[PDB]
Amino acid sequence: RANSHLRSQPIDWTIEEVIQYIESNDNSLAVHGDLFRKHEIDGKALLRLNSEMMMKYMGLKLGPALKICNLVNKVN
């Protein structure tokens, strides 16, 4: 239903599925959902993202950026 990210490979995730992944794995990051929409971060983009980019272009603070980076590491 609203958990389609579970039934698809990260590389094929849509922006909404990326947000789904983040929300479900760390509630404290749910607030940044609109950032991924604004910067159009789908699955393919997520796998190319790094902390410096998130801070420089997405306006994320170091803490959240590191936490997101950690979630990305789990899915490579």
UniProtKB/Swiss-Prot annotation:
Changing M58R: Complete loss of function. Complete loss of self- and ph-p binding activity. Residues 13-76 form the SAM domain. It is found in: Nucleus. It comes from the Eukaryota. Changing K67R: No effect on function. Shows self- and ph-p binding activity comparable to wild-type. Belongs to the SCM family. The SAM domain is essential for function. Polycomb group (PcG) protein. PcG proteins act by forming multiprotein complexes, which are required to maintain the transcriptionally repressive state of homeotic genes throughout development. PcG proteins are not required to initiate repression, but to maintain it during later stages of development. They probably act via the methylation of histones, rendering chromatin heritably changed in its expressibility. Scm associates with the PRC1 core complex containing PSC, PC, PH and Sce/RING1. Forms homotypic and heterotypic interactions. Interacts with the SAM domain of ph-p via its SAM domain in vitro. Interacts with corto in vitro. This is Polycomb protein Scm. The chain holds residues 795 to 869 of 877 of the full protein.
